[PDB]
């Protein structure tokens, strides 16, 4: 009999975001477990979790975004095991995002619309991959972590792409040497094609312009890669997968990039299960594009993936609201272009969700009591980061501050209005604050109304399975575990 954490292969399955297991887990297991479905349980290790002693700090040593949920590494993983081995279920626990970056307030800059164009030094890479390595090891004592995903994208380097033929021709000589011919040879001159869920074959060749300047814009990313992969290695004495996020950039992933990034990963020996790309998906919003160029470019993307052994992997899977999914007709464009082979993300949603709840009783109740307590706790504290320009400032929070100022005065918005776009990004500092004798009074909390409250943890319960079931039977999740089960068979 299978059951517990299990490294499922790439396979379609969903992965979940569990940044409050105590409330969390109850209906996302009973959805997993009513719909036959092999299911992730994360936490992203860059901005969600953190290692426990980073979790267990006295308050202020570290910035509110790191590990803003409050839930460690052993937690969440432990919890998550536990919990479905209690339930019989096959679940794979994730480590979401890995990512190399300066700080957890730039990492979430980087997907709340802030432009921050900070540049690493040497040192912040040595201690950001110090960090990684320290949240690895805590992953793997737990005897539960079955795969990672890794985020290098801040180490992308877009002047590659601008540099004068001169220089390019130069550098790329001169940090590849003797390797420079064999590079171009993967590439130049060759057509690769890559045929997808429509049946459609795509063409694509490489000039030996294009090749260097990919060279040297990945580079580093790649380097820092086969490092935390290595590391990886080191540790695992059970089998595992890696996820390539390439999603939190600027601009659109291209079909040459990746089918570039893929090889030259193959090349060092990694041979990642899935690949993230940007493909105009924005957090906390449904998706604003057209369907049927989403759907080409999915499907362009999706055929190169498969031609690596390794399936998309669809981050900011959650949309507008707590029920709108990522709007009408999205999860069809997806499937059409994946056959629906796909891994699909989604995380913060759930306590948007819970949230949202709270302030949907009324006011003389001590649900709304504490909606209005959250709200207003968030609210200051983020007046207090613009004002003493702490790690979250930005004019782009301060904007959103001062519209939600103006939308109250002007009776266009409701004072503590949950849709709010400063909540709808930043509510998450809720769970990271903290009372005078050092608790995360706000996180304890929600747990107790849980815990305690019958009618509240009835129908949160009842919400967050529900919320689990659209994704389920929007991307048809349903009876997933038999190609998990026939990956695991080949151990």
Same mark, same amino acid.
């Given at each position: $009999? /299978?059951?517990?954490?299990?490294?499922?292969?790439?396979?379609?399955? !969903?992965?979940?975001?569990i940044r409050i297991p105590e409330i969390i887990l109850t209906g996302i297991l009973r959805?997993?477990?009513?719909?036959?479905?092999?299911?992730?349980? =994360?936490?992203?290790?860059?901005?969600?979790?953190?290692?426990?002693?980073?979790?267990?700090?006295?308050?202020?040593?570290?910035?509110?975004?790191?590990?803003?949920?409050g839930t460690?590494?052993?937690?969440?993983?432990?919890m998550?095991?536990?919990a479905? /081995?209690?339930?019989?279920? &096959? &679940?794979?626990?994730?480590?979401?995002?890995?990512?190399?970056? !300066?700080?957890?307030?730039?990492?979430?800059?980087?997907?709340?619309?802030?432009?921050?164009?900070?540049?690493?030094?040497?040192?912040?890479?040595?201690?950001?991959?110090?960090?990684?390595?320290?949240?690895?090891?805590?992953?793997?004592?737990?005897?539960?972590?079955?795969?990672?995903?890794?985020?290098?994208?801040?180490?992308?380097?877009?002047?590659?792409?601008? =540099?004068? !033929?001169?220089?390019? @021709?130069?550098?790329?000589?001169?940090?590849?040497?003797?390797?420079?011919? $064999?590079?171009?040879?993967?590439?130049?001159?060759?057509?690769?094609?890559?045929?997808?869920?429509?049946?459609?074959?795509?063409?694509?060749?490489?000039?030996?312009?294009?090749? =260097?300047?990919?060279?040297?814009?990945?580079?580093?990313?790649?380097?820092?890669?086969?490092?935390?992969?290595?590391?990886?290695?080191?540790?695992?004495?059970?089998?595992?997968?890696?996820?390539?996020?390439?999603?939190?950039?600027?601009?659109?992933?291209?079909?040459?990039?990746?089918?570039?990034?893929?090889?030259?990963?193959? @090349?060092?020996?990694?041979?990642?299960?899935?690949?993230?790309?940007?493909?105009?998906?924005?957090?906390?919003?449904?998706?604003?594009?057209?369907?049927? /160029?989403?759907?080409?470019?999915?499907?362009?993307?999706?055929?190169?993936?498969?031609?690596?052994?390794?399936?998309?992997?669809?981050?900011?899977?959650?949309?507008?609201?707590p029920?709108?999914?990522?709007?009408?007709?999205?999860?069809?464009?997806?499937?059409?272009?994946?056959?629906?082979?796909?891994?699909?993300?989604?995380?913060?949603?759930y306590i948007e969700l819970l949230f949202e709840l709270l302030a949907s009783y009324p006011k003389g109740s001590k649900e709304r009591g504490l909606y209005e307590q959250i709200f207003?706790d968030?609210?200051?504290?983020?007046?207090?980061? &613009?004002?003493?320009?702490?790690?979250?400032?930005?004019?782009?929070?301060?904007?959103?501050?001062?519209?939600? @100022?103006?939308?109250?005065?002007?009776?266009?918005? @409701?004072?503590? $209005?949950p849709?709010?776009?400063?909540?709808?990004?930043?509510s998450? &500092?809720a769970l990271?604050?903290?009372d005078?004798?050092?608790k995360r009074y706000l996180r304890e909390a929600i747990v107790e109304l849980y815990e305690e409250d019958r009618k509240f943890k009835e129908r949160y319960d009842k919400e967050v399975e529900a919320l689990?079931?659209?994704?389920?039977?929007?991307?048809?999740?349903?009876?997933?575990?038999?190609?998990?089960?026939?990956?695991?068979?080949?151990?």
């Amino acid at each position: $009999d /299978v059951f517990g954490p299990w490294y499922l292969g790439p396979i379609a399955h !969903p992965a979940i975001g569990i940044r409050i297991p105590e409330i969390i887990l109850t209906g996302i297991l009973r959805a997993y477990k009513k719909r036959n479905v092999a299911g992730g349980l =994360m936490l992203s290790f860059g901005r969600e979790t953190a290692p426990e002693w980073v979790i267990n700090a006295p308050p202020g040593k570290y910035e509110i975004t790191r590990g803003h949920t409050g839930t460690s590494i052993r937690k969440y993983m432990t919890m998550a095991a536990e919990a479905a /081995v209690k339930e019989g279920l &096959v &679940v794979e626990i994730e480590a979401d995002h890995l990512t190399v970056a !300066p700080s957890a307030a730039e990492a979430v800059k980087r997907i709340s619309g802030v432009r921050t164009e900070y540049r690493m030094s040497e040192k912040e890479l040595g201690e950001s991959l110090n960090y990684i390595k320290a949240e690895i090891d805590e992953a793997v004592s737990t005897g539960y972590v079955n795969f990672y995903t890794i985020d290098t994208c801040f180490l992308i380097d877009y002047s590659a792409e601008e =540099m004068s !033929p001169g220089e390019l @021709e130069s550098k790329f000589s001169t940090i590849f040497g003797d390797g420079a011919g $064999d590079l171009l040879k993967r590439y130049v001159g060759r057509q690769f094609v890559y045929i997808g869920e429509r049946g459609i074959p795509y063409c694509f060749t490489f000039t030996n312009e294009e090749v =260097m300047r990919l060279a040297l814009k990945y580079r580093e990313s790649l380097k820092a890669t086969k490092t935390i992969c290595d590391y990886i290695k080191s540790k695992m004495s059970k089998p595992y997968g890696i996820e390539i996020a390439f999603d939190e950039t600027p601009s659109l992933t291209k079909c040459k990039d990746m089918i570039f990034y893929l090889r030259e990963l193959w @090349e060092i020996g990694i041979k990642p299960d899935f690949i993230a790309p940007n493909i105009g998906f924005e957090k906390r919003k449904d998706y604003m594009g057209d369907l049927k /160029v989403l759907e080409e470019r999915v499907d362009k993307l999706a055929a190169i993936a498969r031609a690596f052994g390794a399936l998309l992997s669809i981050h900011s899977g959650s949309g507008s609201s707590p029920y709108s999914g990522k709007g009408i007709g999205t999860y069809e464009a997806l499937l059409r272009a994946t056959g629906g082979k796909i891994k699909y993300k989604i995380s913060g949603v759930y306590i948007e969700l819970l949230f949202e709840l709270l302030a949907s009783y009324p006011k003389g109740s001590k649900e709304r009591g504490l909606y209005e307590q959250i709200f207003d706790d968030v609210y200051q504290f983020l007046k207090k980061e &613009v004002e003493e320009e702490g790690v979250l400032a930005s004019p782009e929070l301060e904007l959103q501050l001062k519209r939600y @100022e103006e939308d109250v005065k002007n009776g266009v918005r @409701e004072e503590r $209005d949950p849709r709010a776009d400063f909540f709808r990004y930043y509510s998450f &500092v809720a769970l990271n604050l903290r009372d005078s004798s050092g608790k995360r009074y706000l996180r304890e909390a929600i747990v107790e109304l849980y815990e305690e409250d019958r009618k509240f943890k009835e129908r949160y319960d009842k919400e967050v399975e529900a919320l689990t079931l659209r994704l389920i039977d929007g991307l048809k999740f349903e009876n997933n575990i038999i190609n998990a089960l026939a990956w695991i068979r080949q151990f």
